[PDB]
Amino acid sequence: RSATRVMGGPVTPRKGPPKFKQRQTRQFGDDIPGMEGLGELHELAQYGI
Amino acid sequence: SATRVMGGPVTPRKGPPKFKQRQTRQFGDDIPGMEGLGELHELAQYGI
Amino acid sequence: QVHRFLDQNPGFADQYFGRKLSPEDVANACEDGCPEGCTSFRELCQVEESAALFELVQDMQENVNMERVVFKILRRLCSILHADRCSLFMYRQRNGVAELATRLFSVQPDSVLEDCLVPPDSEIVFPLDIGVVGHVAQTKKMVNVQDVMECPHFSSFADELTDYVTRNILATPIMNGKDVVAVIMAVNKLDGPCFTSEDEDVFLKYLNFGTLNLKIYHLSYLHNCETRRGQVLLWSANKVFEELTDIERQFHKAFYTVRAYLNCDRYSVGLLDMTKEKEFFDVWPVLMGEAQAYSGPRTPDGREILFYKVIDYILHGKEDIKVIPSPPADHWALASGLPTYVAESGFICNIMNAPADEMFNFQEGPLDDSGWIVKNVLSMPIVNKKEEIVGVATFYNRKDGKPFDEQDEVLMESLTQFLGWSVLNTDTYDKMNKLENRKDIAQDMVLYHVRCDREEIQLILPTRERLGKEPADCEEDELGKILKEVLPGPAKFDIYEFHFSDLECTELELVKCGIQMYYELGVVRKFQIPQEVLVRFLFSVSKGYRRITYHNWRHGFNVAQTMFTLLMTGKLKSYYTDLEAFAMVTAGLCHDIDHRGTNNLYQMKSQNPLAKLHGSSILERHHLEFGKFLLSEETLNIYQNLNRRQHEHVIHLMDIAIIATDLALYFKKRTMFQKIVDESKNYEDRKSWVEYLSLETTRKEIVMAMMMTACDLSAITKPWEVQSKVALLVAAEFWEQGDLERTVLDQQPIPMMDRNKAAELPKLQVGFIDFVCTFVYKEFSRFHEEILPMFDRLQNNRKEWKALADEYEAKVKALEEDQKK
Amino acid sequence: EEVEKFLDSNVSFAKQYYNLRYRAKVISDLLGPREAAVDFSNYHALNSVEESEIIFDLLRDFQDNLQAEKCVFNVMKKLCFLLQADRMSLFMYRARNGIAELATRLFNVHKDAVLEECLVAPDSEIVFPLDMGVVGHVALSKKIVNVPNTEEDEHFCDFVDTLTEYQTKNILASPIMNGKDVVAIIMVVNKVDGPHFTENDEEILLKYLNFANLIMKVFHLSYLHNCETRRGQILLWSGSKVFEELTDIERQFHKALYTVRAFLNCDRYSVGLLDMTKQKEFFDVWPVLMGEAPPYAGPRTPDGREINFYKVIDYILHGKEDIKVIPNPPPDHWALVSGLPTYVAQNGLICNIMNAPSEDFFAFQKEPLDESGWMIKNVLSMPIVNKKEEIVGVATFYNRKDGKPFDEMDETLMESLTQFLGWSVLNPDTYELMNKLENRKDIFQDMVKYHVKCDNEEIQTILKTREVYGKEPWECEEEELAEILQGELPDADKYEINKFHFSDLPLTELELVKCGIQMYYELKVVDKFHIPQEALVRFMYSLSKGYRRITYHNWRHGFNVGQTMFSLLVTGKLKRYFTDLEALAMVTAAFCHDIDHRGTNNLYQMKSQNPLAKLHGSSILERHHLEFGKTLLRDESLNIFQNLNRRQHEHAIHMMDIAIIATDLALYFKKRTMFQKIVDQSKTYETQQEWTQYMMLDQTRKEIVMAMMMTACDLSAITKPWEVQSKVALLVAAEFWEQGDLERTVLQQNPIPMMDRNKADELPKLQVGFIDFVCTFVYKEFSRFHEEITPMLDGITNNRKEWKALADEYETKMKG
Ligand SMILES: Nc1nc2c(ncn2[C@@H]2O[C@@H]3COP(=O)(O)O[C@H]3[C@H]2O)c(=O)[nH]1
Ligand SMILES: Nc1nc2c(ncn2[C@@H]2O[C@@H]3COP(=O)(O)O[C@H]3[C@H]2O)c(=O)[nH]1
Ligand SMILES: [Mg+2]
Ligand SMILES: [Mg+2]
Ligand SMILES: [Zn+2]
């Protein structure tokens, strides 16, 4: 027999509505530095080349 | 210093370096269950 | 017998104990001369305690078992502190709330581990503020309640539940890096009214060994949990990035691959519908009263909760993973109602002792034939980057029998969060599928609007009249006879001459001339080209060309006709095989297919999708792609009776041919052609040069590219009566493009494109001739003497344009001097 | 005083009383700060009192603020006293590139030493391989080793002896274990008084290593837990940025590698991105093959492509965060000058470098790279694998923050990071695939838009502006276009445009286009909404061209449906319930109801898995028609809704969406009891005015009524007079026979008798069944709804009667 005189359930001394956790939304984009940098001819220009 | 070495870590044997092999061994439909994951008679008689 | 007298005379007791004890001892005592360590038994007590703690250290060192070591420490501390019993309270964090659960209870100096260990189903889970132990955990300090009746923190729950009376309480929290590992507690001081300050000091100092043991146990557990979290994250990332799939396949792969690291008897994943809005024919029954509105639970996004597919992972015993499409509300996972609540609220639900819960109708007992009873539940909402719940993952019955603590909560939360972000992969996959289907539909529409229909082919292949059969039914000999009696002869139109003019022939006559050009090369027979396919392909090419001023079907036959003359009248077919000439004339036909009337520069400046898809040689690559796609159609695939090597060579040779028509590309590689031409003069006779060049591959590619760029500009080398008219159409097209630039882009066009500078056309044509065409045609005349007429005509046209430009300049000068000066 | 005799008579009571009253005080004093009272200046045999004192002193260091090095050094001092030892040392077990190493952490520890003179900095450690030395032999054997004479040993190395000017004679060593991994090695160097270390000293070492074992276990577990936590945080944080959006490889890599900059614990690290161009275009390979330019000479990836770091991102973290991007970095760059990234790209091997300036393989900088004296000391460079085993980049991590050289845990952490990054290339590649596919779809959509749009030379066939005014249609004024259209457009009365018996047989397609334009002109929706008349004509001609030239579902069917809708609005007086905008949208939907019909019903599209079937789910062809019509209306030269308000435009688009989609028979079959309920509600009202007033306000009933009108117009061919129905039914049968032949050929499935070309003589029976099943309900309900739609019911009744006569004649012929 268990030393705590209880079987079949983790009995709790708290009587009340259960409460549940909040989803973690701690974020666990261009503000990063360096983001900006990541992504004889005249006749040719005359004739659309 | 205790080890009488001031500059840097010193090894007895000095040869060419040995380097790691890139890890590849550890890393479809083989998983079970993926096969399943992805008045009326005249209605069919007239195309519907 | 005299104990009270010893109490009333502390000085006598101190003097008697401080006496040097004789070497004679009582029992063993490890007497290495230890009777007189400043006291009668201080030496003996020191030796015995050192031996006991050394044995405890030995137990700690190998096969770490925190329960046994802590039990032995508590058993010794019961005797040392004179407490009636000691206890240990494990610290766990569920749902973000700290809880203290028993792990060692009613430990006595004459007890055993089996009679003091607390199984997971017999835990007195005290919350953080419902007892003195909770106050100890919250304050993170020792609490010594001399009398517990007046303690504002004492809870009589445990002592009533265990048929016990507590009078004095001493407890401390086992500390590790500002994280409360556990709370030791000693109650019911057996000898004194309460626990003295000396007992408090002993409680602090003697518990450092237990502190170290619990620190080791907690560190091992945390390290194992973090290793499992890393492994599950890595394995989920590997399967997610394996390919692009839907929600179901990706989630199934990720969840099944990591089943070993979850340590759960069972877990199920439910998938929610994403239909934000119902279509009109589904909203009609509700509005018209034919059906009732849905008054059931809704997601925080105002969405119907409907698990359309639940994947069940049953791992206890036999692995029998199941997929339940449209699961009923009677499903064992959904019957509890927890997934529905998780969908409604988007909370993290951690349930301890599920059968004893009241809010959720967890099943009474055995679920399956194996009698597996739901005991501990952890349910997680799978939420994408847009804060929308895609599904609910629920885990059951942790394999070790303990409830889901904070570490398992964070372990599964990391997995669910990673998979929720992975929904972007599924959204991108489905958008890939949608875009591919839309592009295929557009391609089919283009193919219908470009491919020559059943009725249009009868204009060149009359078979419903001559033979009464559709072209697909007539044999090759019949269609050959029909084409011979229908197609124009080589002398009807001078397709073999450099002075060919299309201004006196209809478009249908041009297509017939193209078929005749194909027949002249003799490629129909040796390659077994289906004649109906040839006619259909040529008509489809004619239709594919737009109806614009210059770059229409006529320019594209004149490009291919010139190449036919070059091959057969310029005698440049000596270096090229029949297959190469076939694939090279076809590329001449698809030279400027679907040209939009604007040059390559306009595509970049107007930011057309063409400019984004290609980047360099935009329109040339577009023409190549359209021609190859049109050829890919079976009914227009002239390259269908060809070997795989032959077809590959044909397509490859087409890529150089079509792309080299770009004037910018020609300007960067014409010196190589000049060097190749210079090699011809090194050789003695034409025969030796033919033998050498016909075997070279790169040099033939260069020559073919230059033949492309010469055929493109061949309109200039036409007789003046034709060039004068063609230049007007070219100028009109460029003027239209300049007007488009001025209107849409608000940019001033270059003088060649400016409609206002129409009188400068002769000078611009002279400059164009001097800059571009002169090199190509002079080098070709030097290369082959048969192409000399194409150069003399160029010089004559240049002379005429120079005369016109000089006339315009004289008029301008005369206007300038005679009035303005 | 007589009691004093009693405790002497029975000293067990005295022992028990001392335990009850003074044991707690003794334990408190022993576990207090205190100090060991053992005489450390002599070599006497350890008494049990002194042994207990030593044990308690070792236990005194078991505090919460566990300084592993200090506690282990105290244990070593006590062991030096106990073991008759001269000096002792510790070798941490570090795992570099596969080869485990043993570096000195505590050295020259004696009985009168301090932590300052025994602690070894990472720049003073003596790294020892597993192969050489008694230390290496102990590490490999994983067992205590006693060497009674160094001279006769086969593993002893004089390297440390020469480097420290010390002579070692007798060696005793033992490894410290955590599970089965060797953590550290405690070794002794000399027996002060004795030939060697006896078995008693071996037992003492084993007895007293338990405290050291526990301390080292705590230290190792803490370090491993911290490393695994950092790995998990790195993976999750990097996944967050990877799944933030779909971008190219550079942006994704920068986000991932900058978000986790704190977790890497590196003073500096740089990532170089390799070019992915496997095969160079023909115009680029020409000069190399022709001798104009020399071919590529040296560094080549295992994939066979040239090593060319086209962009290097270097993250400087030791001082001011100096995240920098170097497009086309020169070889002089501090990251690439060493040649380690080039070698890694050549091989694809994880390289851990300790004491980089001392290395000779790579030319590491031996001068301060920064103004603060920063030195490259420990380097770790790894590839970015990629799913095709194609090295796409090289990540190099420089000096660690704590100063220790990179070990197996750091290798594992950075390897998990780089493996995740290499796996996270599917998203950058899919981004380019998305962009190219979307551009290609836009290109082909522009092509289809041109091929169906009425060109400027075809609009002159109706809008004869060139031959009347000499100007192009876009130049002429609105009044001029109105006058031209009035001159050209037909008369509604003469052509029976607003009659239920309209026949398109004697009319040309251009005539039907002009009639359709006249339909818009009759509703008076042109002036009210200021519809550009040129755009109206061009859009009608575009609708005419867009319909395919198939047997039945050609543009004549679309014009017939539009005419039926117009007659229902005007002749049927159903425009009472609808506004002018709704009438315009409904007529436009009727004209676009079957645009670009392929000639095969929805079932064939689903069976053949046509891209239409994969794109649209429920109403494949109808949704395709709606999409194509809305795309046609989106063109500026074809948008007749350009002058509408935003609310008006949205209402019209919604109304068209309802109308076109409802044309399918499947939706009509399910939602047809609603029409009966609406008709009954109509008959409930007393006067038509009240019912009309109720209808113009309610929207759902209006939508259902129009949905039924769409199906009434789509089947209007049956309600036509017999001389028209007799030919239209044959055309419909011909198209369905063509679809059946296509099914039999491609899908290899037997067609239904309706679509079976062989059962051509059963057409009257199938038409009678069709009339009895689908159309009769619609037309009877509409005739009950409005008595003006009665001629439709009369026509369908007459057609059914004649089809029944034909079917009865056929059945009588089959008798025999
Ligand atoms: N039977 C028994 N009860 C204990 C023991 N230790 C603590 N408790 C009880 O458990 C309870 C937990 O909340 P409290 O600290 O307020 O009071 C405590 C005591 O009443 C123990 O060793 N044996
Ligand atoms: N002077 C000195 N040498 C040591 C010490 N510890 C180990 N060594 C030496 O370092 C050497 C490493 O290789 P070996 O084990 O063969 O032999 C060892 C010893 O000779 C120490 O504490 N002091
Ligand atoms: Mg071109
Ligand atoms: Mg339809
Ligand atoms: Zn229709």
Numbering used by the authors:
A (entry chain D): 11 to 38, 51 to 61, 77 to 86
B (entry chain C): 12 to 38, 51 to 61, 77 to 86
C (entry chain B): 7 to 827
D (entry chain A): 7 to 822
Q: What do the study's own words say?
A:
Phototransduction in retinal rods occurs when the G protein–coupled photoreceptor rhodopsin triggers the activation of phosphodiesterase 6 (PDE6) by GTP-bound alpha subunits of the G protein transducin (GαT). PDE6 is a 3′,5′-cyclic nucleotide phosphodiesterase and a member of a superfamily of enzymes that play critical roles in compartmentalizing cyclic nucleotide signaling and regulating many physiological processes. PDE6 is the most catalytically active PDE and is the only family member that has coevolved an autoinhibitory PDE6γ subunit, which enables G-protein–stimulated activation and completely prevents basal activity in the absence of GαT.
To see how this inhibitor affects the structural features of PDE6, we first determined a high-resolution reconstruction of the cryo-EM structure for the PDE6 holoenzyme alone. PDE6γ residues Phe50, Asp52, Pro55, and Thr62 form hydrogen bonds with PDEβ residues Glu249, Arg255, His258, and Asp252, respectively, through interactions both between side chains and with the polypeptide backbone. Notably, despite its intrinsically disordered nature, PDE6γ adopts a largely stable conformation and remains tightly associated with the PDE6αβ subunit core across all variability components. For the PDE6 heterotetramer, the first variability component resolves bending of the PDE6α GAF domains toward the PDE6β catalytic core, which is associated with destabilization of the “ponytail motif”. Our high-resolution structure of PDE6 holoenzyme revealed a detailed interaction network between the glycine-rich region of PDE6γ and the PDE6α/β dimerization interface. Our high-resolution structure reveals that PDEβ H258 makes a critical hydrogen bond with the peptide backbone of PDE6γ P55.
